[PDB]
RNA sequence: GGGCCCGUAGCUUAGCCAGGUCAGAGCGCCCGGCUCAUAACCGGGCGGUCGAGGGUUCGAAUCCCUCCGGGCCCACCA
């Protein structure tokens with residue numbers, strides 16, 4: 001007997017199925033034909049800016065205890081040769097079978113696949129250092145996510161109960177009783193979180209894709225996911241599995257503290273002062289700029305962000321903030337932001353008398369219409385509405401890796417349920 | 418004492434000095450849609466009679482008179 005970590009990635013299709021699903025099918029075969037599957041499988045989300053991602057850049061791995069690693073590999077290669085969309089060109093699968101003892105040695109790699117950008121060669125190099133049995137299909141871009149999935153270190157993590165439909169019910173649209181999910185959220189939240197967007201009315205955990213996935217509930221315990229699991233009404237649940245994921249951890253973010261430049265296709269946490277004030281563009285798309293330890297940084301607050309814009313617009317030149325987000329097209333697409341300090345803002349106004357006064361020459365104060373005389377203008381402090389604290393985008397906007405403010409222990413949280 | 422600017426839906430604005438689809442548009446808002454691929458025109462709807470008053474004309478947001486409100490400049494007196 002031996003302990004081997006199986007890792008899989010890039011196997012789905014635009015029109016195809018899910019990668020967690022194929023890992024479940026392989027698991028079943030391992031469980032009854034080769035040995036046992038130890039504990040909960042793992043869904044490790046990686047760099048959410050990769051262009052190759054089919055929709056979320058999620059990779060899968062699971063511990064196994066088989067008698068002979070050779071058969072194991074064949075068995076898994078098979079499940080791929082049958083349930084993997086090898087047809088598409090956006091799908092280049094890869095599988096890894098690393099010995100448990102060796103998993104740890106991959107934390108640096110997985111880490112680099114989550115926060116930065118890697119290359120197929122880099123994955124093949126790791127494989128080459130420990131002669132890790134692997135499966136490279138076509139290009140094999142999957143070997144990246146595969147290794148990562150196994151090496152990814154979870155110091156923090158959330159759980160996710162994923163239920164799949166019956167095969168015949170595929171393609172067709174899912175049938176379910178919405179209202180049951182709110183009863184569910186209204187009864188288990190925060191425990192189970194990011195499952196519904198009230199102030200935007202939506203059920204996020206229920207996809208609308210070709211994927212076998214019926215629904216997918218996130219929580220902080222099996223207890224919650226369990227209570228939730230039965231406390232909901234939907235079509236009959238065929239297969240179902242609970243995954244340990246780095247979902248809602250911010251494992252992708254890079255503190256400014258730890259780097260010099262800021263490259264595109266990466267995410268960070270920065271502090272800065274609004275140099276240029278907020279502003280829209282067709283579609284409800286808000287933008288602004290902050291002065292940073294790097295220079296002039298621009299922040300995007302796209303429409304899908306909803307109620308977030310209602311806060312961002314309130315930002316004024318000179319405010320101190322902390323922006324969390326990924327950078328693409330040289331901009332930081334806000335996922336959440338902290339309002340550290342607010343800059344007061346005054347206004348110049350011409351005096352009165354009867355009524356208001358005008359300007360009498362460049363250096364000659366102001367005179368009435370009311371025939372009077374005054375020297376200075378009416379300066380006034382304009383109280384703001386915006387307030388310091390942490391503001392995040394709404395549930396329906398959340399990105400898998402994005403840590404919801406409900407999980408963070410910081411004061412000044414304005415939570416959007 | 419004189420000389421200018423500017424005011425079109427809640428904002429920001431086309432059109433205005435070539436007056437005859439008297440009202441276009443982006444944001445907002447109301448209402449939907451997409452998606453648990455951070456996402457640079459996703460939609461529909463309501464919404465202005467064009468600062469106020471007045472005059473010319475077959476007719477003005479659109480040319481003229483003046484007023485309200487914003488705001489500016491040059492001189493003079495001292």
Ligand SMILES: Nc1ncnc2c1ncn2[C@@H]1O[C@H](COP(=O)(O)OP(=O)(O)OP(=O)(O)O)[C@@H](O)[C@H]1O
Pocket residue numbers: 009010011012013017018019020046047050052053054055056057058059092112113114116117118119140141142143144145146
């Ligand atoms: N940091 C990275 N650098 C380079 N390539 C990466 C990186 N992270 C992931 N990849 C590659 O991006 C591709 C993602 O494809 P994949 O099909 O896994 O998307 P998915 O969104 O995970 O699919 P699904 O969510 O439907 O199961 C894989 O080849 C993965 O190896």
